[PDB]
Design a protein around this ligand. Structure first.
Ligand SMILES: CC(=O)Nc1ccccc1C(=O)NN
Length: 279
């Protein structure tokens, strides 16, 4: 059923809440035993948001390999994403270790450091060229190279150096800066343009490791980003773009990380992003 028609049918009936709860009811449930170990309590921002054991990203150290991050692997779309929480004061070094070990080219950030008067994630990148950051626990150095600030998003060029081998890589930081404190954007125009800037970059492409995407919890706004990307590209691939069932793509993605899409408004916005994106 053409999603644009399904959309108007849900909107006229005002049943967004009922569709959304159907997804919550049918969603996968897998063990998260490593996340709940007592040694990992300060590695988790929220007690009710954990990566599944089967799909969690492992840090390449013998000490403690745990980070709140998941590999979403979409087989038919031929895309991979890592979805992770906003780094904490004690996980900033782990975050950049993961970016290094997984060979990511891009980081996508969908939140502000402060929202609603509270801290939503650590200040994990350098704000001035001449004041670089060093993560002593993971032996990495991070330098701001350049910054391009636009109305809806900022793009930063960063240099990440493995102080152990003295190899360097260029990482692109794509920061969406205008998601509102409450609700969802009124129009997806600026979200879609942000998405096609990340694609243009090569960050989503198979010659690199998976893109790292995050918000505060790594399930809401992060969910919207990878659902829209995957749904649009399936439409570019299949002989019938109307066969693309957004609810079925979301349940497939929810086999890899719990809670993706947090509200009925985010589900509606995702439809609006794919519907408008198809034009
Ligand atoms: C399929 C589609 O409409 N993509 C976009 C959406 C919104 C803004 C830009 C683009 C784009 O294509 N950029 N190169």
């Amino acid at each position: 059923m053409e999603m644009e028609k399904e959309f108007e049918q849900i909107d006229k009936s005002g049943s967004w809440a009922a569709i959304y709860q159907d997804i919550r009811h049918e969603a996968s449930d897998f063990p998260s035993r490593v996340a709940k170990l007592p040694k990992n309590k300060n590695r988790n921002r929220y007690r009710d948001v954990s990566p599944f054991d089967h799909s969690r990203i492992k840090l390449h150290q013998e000490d403690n390999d745990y980070i709140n991050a998941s590999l979403i692997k979409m087989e038919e779309a031929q895309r991979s994403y890592i979805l992770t929480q906003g780094p904490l004061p004690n996980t900033v070094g782990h975050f950049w270790e993961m970016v290094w070990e997984q060979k990511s080219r891009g980081v996508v950030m969908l939140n502000r450091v402060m929202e609603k008067g509270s801290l939503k994630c650590a200040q994990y990148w350098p704000q001035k060229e001449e004041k670089e950051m060093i993560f002593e626990d993971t032996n990495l150095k991070l330098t701001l190279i350049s910054e391009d600030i636009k109305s809806y998003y900022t793009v930063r060029q960063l240099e990440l150096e493995n102080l152990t081998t003295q190899e360097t890589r260029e990482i692109l930081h794509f920061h969406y800066t205008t998601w509102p404190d409450f609700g969802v954007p009124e129009s997806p125009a600026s979200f879609l343009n942000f998405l096609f800037k990340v694609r243009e970059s090569g960050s989503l492409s198979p010659e690199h490791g998976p893109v790292v995407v995050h918000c505060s919890a790594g399930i809401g706004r992060s969910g919207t980003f990878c659902l829209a990307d995957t749904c649009l590209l399936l439409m570019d691939k299949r002989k019938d773009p109307s066969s693309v069932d957004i609810k079925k793509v979301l349940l497939e993605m929810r086999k890899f990380r719990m809670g993706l899409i947090q509200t009925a408004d985010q589900l509606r916005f995702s439809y609006l992003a794919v519907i408008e994106g198809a034009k």
